[PDB]
Amino acid sequence: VTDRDRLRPPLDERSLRDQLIGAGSGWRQLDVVAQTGSTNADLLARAASGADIDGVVLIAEHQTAGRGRHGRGWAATARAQIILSVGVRVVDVPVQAWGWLSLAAGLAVLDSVAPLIAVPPAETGLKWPNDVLARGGKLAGILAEVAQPFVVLGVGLNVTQAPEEVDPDATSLLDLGVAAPDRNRIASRLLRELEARIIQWRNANPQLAADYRARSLTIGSRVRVELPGGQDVVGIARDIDDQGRLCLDVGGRTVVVSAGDVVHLR
Numbered sequence: 001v002t003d004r005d006r007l008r009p010p011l012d013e014r015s016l017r018d019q020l021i022g023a024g025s026g027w028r029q030l031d032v033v034a035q036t037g038s039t040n041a042d043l044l045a046r047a048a049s050g051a052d053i054d055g056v057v058l059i060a061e062h063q064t065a066g067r068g069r070h071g072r073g074w075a076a077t078a079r080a081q082i083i084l085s086v087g088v089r090v091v092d093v094p095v096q097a098w099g100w101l102s103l104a105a106g107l108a109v110l111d112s113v114a115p116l117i118a119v120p121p122a123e124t125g126l127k128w129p130n131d132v133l134a135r136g137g138k139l140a141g142i143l144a145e146v147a148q149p150f151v152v153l154g155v156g157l158n159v160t161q162a163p164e165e166v167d168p169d170a171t172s173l174l175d176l177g178v179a180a181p182d183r184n185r186i187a188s189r190l191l192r193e194l195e196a197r198i199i200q201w202r203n204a205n206p207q208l209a210a211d212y213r214a215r216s217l218t219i220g221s222r223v224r225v226e227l228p229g230g231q232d233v234v235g236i237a238r239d240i241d242d243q244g245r246l247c248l249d250v251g252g253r254t255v256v257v258s259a260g261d262v263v264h265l266r
């Protein structure tokens, strides 16, 4: 709505750089662009042209051709979200562990906005694999894409984004009760949390898996998992394995899923 536009001041690039670039911080480069097609596509293009995108941060005020998992889109309007992509060098890490990098990102996003909520409503946590939920609504979506030797981590976090603007099952910090969300503070918290989780992932820290399970909305729930190819599997989510894959209990049989869409059942 037009009223929410007043609640959407521009990001401060200079200030974010002062806070996030320098001693004690792994981020080497940060840019805020007014608009782009897809921040993920941009960092992928940079890498494909020889640039070292490790520790590089790209933030867009607006994204006109956003991308979701397996061919889907991501909708946004100007200054209503935190829209960023991050480059991570991964070649030094075994390929089996790359799946955990995306789980780590969602954990970082959740922890960056969790205390801003007045009281924990039902369904505030992480849905496997790339979903930050709050009150059942999708608060943020994570997209990891490969460009050797890097992985580009993308985050779309609904700050003041109205569900009617993007998606019916969406929610935002504003629609959760946060009156005047400051994207500068939130982005700063987010990238600081993200830095910690990436280091943890890179060093195979046990705390990463433990912290994920503690915030998982999926583990322990009856779920319908829509597999790639259109097949549905119904069971009970039990655990995450060492590759970040979802372990399903289907009537006593174990089904391990590497990718798919999860729906929490009654």
Ligand SMILES: [N-]=[N+]=N[C@@H]1[C@H](O)[C@@H](CNS(=O)(=O)NC(=O)CCCC[C@@H]2SC[C@@H]3NC(=O)N[C@@H]32)O[C@H]1n1cnc2c(N)ncnc21
Pocket: 037, 038, 039, 040, 041, 065, 066, 067, 068, 069, 070, 072, 073, 074, 075, 076, 083, 084, 085, 130, 138, 139, 140, 141, 142, 143, 154, 155, 156, 157, 158, 161, 166, 167, 169, 170, 171
């Ligand atoms: N159901 N469905 N429909 C929409 C779409 O089909 C679906 C896609 N979700 S998804 O397949 O699990 N993928 C994701 O959640 C990952 C999205 C990553 C976006 C980030 S933003 C910066 C970076 N650059 C990119 O191009 N992508 C990444 O989410 C719905 N959707 C679109 N915009 C949304 C909304 N702003 N908030 C919540 N949900 C919404």
